[PDB]
Amino acid sequence: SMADEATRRVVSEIPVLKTNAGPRDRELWVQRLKEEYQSLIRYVENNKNADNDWFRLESNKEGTRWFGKCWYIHDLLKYEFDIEFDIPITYPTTAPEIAVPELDGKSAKMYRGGKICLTDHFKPLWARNVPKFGLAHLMALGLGPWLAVEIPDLIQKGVIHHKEK
């Protein structure tokens, strides 16, 4: 399987998650959040070591609303976008929907209201890994490759401009 190897190559140094809990699930949700934060911070460390430190994320106190920034490099210029998402009640079986609000209306690969539209292979990939994947994997397998198509396309089309700073 090409798909299985490609997935492993991208995610095999990201800590795997374990707990089946979503936002309503009390002590089990607190445990799931420990897994999410340990997986995210190891992914960030790996990214820094790879010269690919490409996002920051924070949450509200209960871990149900996430927001931060991602960065994308094209022809050596660095572009920054704000990102946000909510945690679905049926997480982690259901995947969260990342939004990049500044690009609302600017990419055909997006829904009304700024949510990115991933390819049809992402959902079954998430589904077959539940509950091992978390927010680090959503970033690595979902937003990362979305940016790698859409940002170059929108720069070429003259939709995205770099601000002289």
Swiss-Prot record:
Keywords: Disease variant, Isopeptide bond, Ubl conjugation, Ubl conjugation pathway. The keyword Protein biosynthesis does not apply. One of its GO terms (cellular component) is extracellular exosome. Changing I41R: Abolished interaction with UFL1. Changing F122A: Decreased UFM1 transfer. Changing D51A: Decreased ribosome ufmylation. Gene3D superfamilies: Ubiquitin Conjugating Enzyme (3.10.110.10). The active site is at C117 (glycyl thioester intermediate). There is a cross-link at K123 (Glycyl lysine isopeptide (Lys-Gly) (interchain with G-Cter in UFM1)). One of its GO terms (biological process) is brain development. GO terms for molecular function: UFM1 conjugating enzyme activity; UFM1 transferase activity. It comes from the Eukaryota. Pfam families: UFC1. Ufmylated at Lys-123. Deufmylated by UFSP1. Belongs to the ubiquitin-conjugating enzyme family. UFC1 subfamily. Interacts with UBA5 (via C-terminus). Interacts with UFL1. Interacts with UFM1. Interacts with KIRREL3. In absence of UBA5, the active site is solvated by water molecules thereby reducing its nucleophilic activity. A linker region of UBA5 is required to reduce the amount of water molecules in the vicinity of the active site and elevate its nucleophilic activity. It is linked to Neurodevelopmental disorder with spasticity and poor growth: An autosomal recessive disorder apparent soon after birth or in early infancy. NEDSG is characterized by axial hypotonia, delayed psychomotor development, poor feeding, failure to thrive, peripheral spasticity with hyperreflexia, poor overall growth, and microcephaly in most patients. Additional variable features include contractures, facial dysmorphisms, and ocular movement abnormalities. E2-like enzyme which specifically catalyzes the second step in ufmylation. Accepts the ubiquitin-like modifier UFM1 from the E1 enzyme UBA5 and forms an intermediate with UFM1 via a thioester linkage. Ufmylation is involved in various processes, such as ribosome recycling, response to DNA damage, interferon response or reticulophagy (also called ER-phagy). This is Ubiquitin-fold modifier-conjugating enzyme 1. It comes from Homo sapiens (Human).
